[PDB]
């Protein structure tokens, strides 16, 4: 199910497949900010948001509109502050994507994943004829993507 409160249907959608988590940077190794001084307070607060914006800022700069995010349960997932941005940025977004699914996903949609920001570029940005979340069962809502210029065999 979608994670956006407000984005329901998209036309001419451009899909991008993203792997790296969207939250505070955490090293694979143990890392920690030490707080001992004054301007540590605001800067960190501000700088992490500036960190995420450029994430979000660059992602929008690609012109994409639909986000796919896999599970990162081993570590931090998508930050809601990023979700705040995307909702501010009016960008379709999906969390909780199965590592088994992506091959079928990319095979189906034709958008090879992106696991680093510089790697994120519109050449790999797939686009679709239309995609959105249908609603059946009264409220049993399902995500749909119909129409792709790149026909996957799957």
């Amino acid at each position: 199910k979608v994670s956006n409160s407000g984005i329901t249907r998209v036309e001419k959608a451009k899909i991008g497949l993203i792997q790296f988590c969207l939250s505070a940077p955490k090293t694979d190794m143990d890392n920690q900010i030490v707080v001992s001084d004054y301007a540590q307070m605001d800067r960190v607060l501000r700088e992490e948001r500036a960190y995420i914006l450029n994430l979000v800022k660059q992602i929008k700069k690609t012109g994409c509109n639909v986000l796919l995010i896999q599970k990162s349960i081993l570590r931090d997932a998508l930050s809601d502050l990023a979700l705040h941005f995307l909702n501010k940025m009016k960008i379709m977004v999906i969390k909780d994507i199965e590592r088994e699914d992506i091959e079928f996903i990319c095979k189906t949609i034709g958008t090879k994943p992106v696991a680093h920001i510089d790697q994120f570029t519109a050449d790999m940005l797939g686009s679709a004829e239309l995609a959105e979340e249908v609603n059946l069962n009264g409220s049993g809502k399902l995500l749909k993507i119909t129409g792709c210029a790149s026909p996957g065999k799957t």
Partner: peptide
């Protein structure tokens, strides 16, 4: 607008 936080397209909330 429900607001998950205070923010701006510029970094300052």
């Amino acid at each position: 607008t429900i607001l998950s936080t205070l923010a701006n397209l510029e970094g300052e909330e």
